């Protein structure tokens, strides 16, 4: 009876009934690579991990019997894919279980910036009282009309396509930029495509990020590029925290070149309003990295990951795997 | 009933020395039980035994389908059942499959490797007619991988 370990977690009520007659389940509840028990490093066949722990090549070499790693989610930028292939370890993930949940959360943030609703609710709890019409025009100053505006999207993937369809019902004009796609994808969906990142920033009133975090796009929104945006634009980020330089973003908000920004992922987590470069920056909305959670979505992704482990144990690698991301590098 | 309301397996566990005291232990040893009402039952071959099973299964809340290519028209009207025309269609919409046909020369290894992959995820299988209708080599692999929850 092999051993399967959950690296960062404590609850295993869903995976246990599946992997009970083929393996032995255990958890570590670790927060770093130095908090892994010695028994795991010697007698582990498979592992399950969330986004809260990062594994490097040195960490991978400490395992002596690992054969497969399954990531519960869609992102795998916290695992060294190429290094694991050389050592003979397969990496899997759940590609699409929260596509629609993330798309709905992106639209919610966009509407909050135009039709100010979170800020108005926050003002009432602080004790602000508004009675006359002139007071109403002042507290809610800054709202705009959605129809006629231009929306820019960086990366037209599963989530990117879902956002584009919903944005057209409100009257937006949609552009996108993606250098890894084929020709004619925009013809099917009736969108407009640009060829350079600079051209997208020149003609956009709201920018949303939906790309992946590879090694060629770290700090994509840096100091130089943030000065190419329009006067008084918005910014929404729900993909990854490493795509935006928070130090340069804070200066833009203070000077007024950017009207507002809604963020769901940050460079350093967990996030606190009293620490970091964004300690005192006006017009900011933040959420604790929960743009994927749902009652149905949580159960679906946990069951799929458990069944991927069972096929690997009672089959062959990587012939029996459905979602393998390091097949080319695997030897 | 043994597959849904696990009773043989629970009795076997007690003889091996397993001890269960708390409620959490009860939910773990008997994990997998389901609710009968609302499920679909598929029958292959509506003969003397097949008709008897269909009448008793309706008292528990099952939904009954059957497949038989050698019968006349309107047999399902008398008994108030539902009839399909192909074997593949029966396997797509069934949660429990029972075999009640005969072993002629046109149905040897009816449940072969190719057909066992057309069943639903986590279905049951009951065989009490003949041994030559099921390929045991392909059935064993399905049980290990988890595509079939159980078999009697």
């Amino acid at each position: 009876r092999p051993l399967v370990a959950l690296l960062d977690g404590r609850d295993c009520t869903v995976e246990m009934p599946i992997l009970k007659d083929v393996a032995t389940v255990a958890f570590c509840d670790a927060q770093s690579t130095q908090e892994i028990h010695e028994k795991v490093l010697n007698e582990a066949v498979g592992a399950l991990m969330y986004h809260t722990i990062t594994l490097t090549r040195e960490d991978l070499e400490k395992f002596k019997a690992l054969r497969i790693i399954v990531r519960i989610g869609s992102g795998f930028d916290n695992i060294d894919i190429k290094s694991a292939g050389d050592l003979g370890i397969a990496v899997c993930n759940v590609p699409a279980a929260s596509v629609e949940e993330t798309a709905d959360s992106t639209l919610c943030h966009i509407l909050n910036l135009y039709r100010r609703a979170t800020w108005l609710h926050q003002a009432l709890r602080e004790g602000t009282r508004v009675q006359s019409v002139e007071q109403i025009r002042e507290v809610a100053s800054g709202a705009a009309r959605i129809r006629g505006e231009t929306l820019g999207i960086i990366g037209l993937g599963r989530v990117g396509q879902a956002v584009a369809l919903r944005a057209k019902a409100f009257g937006f004009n949609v552009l996108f930029y993606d250098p890894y796609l084929s020709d004619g994808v925009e013809r099917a969906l009736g969108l407009q495509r640009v060829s350079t990142l600079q051209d997208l920033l020149f003609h956009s009133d709201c920018v949303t990020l939906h790309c992946g975090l590879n090694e060629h796009n770290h700090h994509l929104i840096n100091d130089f590029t943030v000065k190419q945006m329009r006067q008084g634009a918005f910014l929404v980020n729900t993909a990854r925290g490493g795509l935006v330089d928070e130090k340069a973003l804070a200066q833009a908000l203070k000077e007024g070149r950017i009207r507002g920004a809604a963020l769901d992922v940050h460079e350093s987590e967990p996030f606190s309003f009293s620490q970091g470069p964004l300690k005192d920056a006006p017009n900011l909305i933040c959420t604790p990295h929960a743009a994927w959670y749902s009652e149905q979505a949580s159960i679906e992704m946990r069951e799929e990951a458990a069944r991927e482990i069972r096929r690997a144990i009672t089959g062959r690698i990587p012939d029996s795997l459905k979602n393998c991301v390091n097949k080319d590098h695997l030897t | 009933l043994n597959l849904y309301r696990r009773a043989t397996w629970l009795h076997q566990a007690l003889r091996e020395g397993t001890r269960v005291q708390s409620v959490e232990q009860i939910r773990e040893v008997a994990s997998g039980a389901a609710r009968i009402r609302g499920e679909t039952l598929g029958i292959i071959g509506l003969g003397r035994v097949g008709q008897a099973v269909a009448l008793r299964a309706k008292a528990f809340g099952f939904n009954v389908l059957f497949y038989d290519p050698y019968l006349s028209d309107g047999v399902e009207r008398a008994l108030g059942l539902q009839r399909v025309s192909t074997l593949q269609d029966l396997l797509f919409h069934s949660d429990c499959v029972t075999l009640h046909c005969g072993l002629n020369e046109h149905n040897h290894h009816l449940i072969n490797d190719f057909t066992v992959k057309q069943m639903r995820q986590g279905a049951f299988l009951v065989n009490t007619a003949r041994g030559g209708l099921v390929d045991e080599k392909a059935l064993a692999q399905a049980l290990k991988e988890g595509r079939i929850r159980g078999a009697a």
């Binding site: 958890f27 670790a30 028990h37 | -």
Partner: peptide
């Protein structure tokens, strides 16, 4: 977040995964 008022912290119930937390 349920408060653990398990005063008599005994071990008469081994009901789940093996805890290997450090």
């Amino acid at each position: 977040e349920a408060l653990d008022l398990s005063m008599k912290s005994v071990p008469w119930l081994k009901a789940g995964a093996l805890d290997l937390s450090v």
